[PDB]
Ligand binder design. Structure first.
Ligand SMILES: *[PH](O)(O)OCC(C)(C)[C@H](O)C(=O)NCCC(=O)NCCSC(=O)c1cccnc1
Length: 89
């Protein structure tokens, strides 16, 4: 989307950064990577407030949000909206 490539690249960088994140089928449900739901979610929540200065907003949890990468892209777009770039080079 406007910056969905950064989300996949940013999220994947924590797990497999030595591999091109754009070379990963972003059409795969990241549920398998649910690992970020807890370990990464805590690091991302604290990091998000550390860099962007946004409240963790962990009052409500939505496990269904990790069902697909696109679902997460909408959450970031609604909260923040970075520059728009072409996902495919
Ligand atoms: P664990 O066993 O993974 O804990 C499971 C649950 C589902 C409770 C998980 O910890 C949780 O709280 N997830 C709820 C949904 C959630 O908070 N997901 C965050 C969306 S990503 C968003 O916060 C964000 C931050 C930084 C960059 N992009 C998006």
């Amino acid at each position: 989307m406007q910056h969905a490539s950064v989300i996949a690249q940013f999220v994947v960088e924590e797990f497999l950064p030595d591999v091109a994140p754009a070379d990963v089928d972003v059409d795969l449900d990241l549920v398998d990577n649910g690992v970020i739901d807890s370990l990464g979610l805590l690091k991302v929540i604290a990091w998000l407030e550390d860099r962007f200065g946004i409240a963790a907003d962990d009052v409500e949890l939505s496990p269904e949000h990790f069902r697909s990468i696109r679902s997460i892209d909408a959450f970031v777009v609604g909260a923040t909206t970075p520059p728009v770039e072409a996902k495919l080079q």
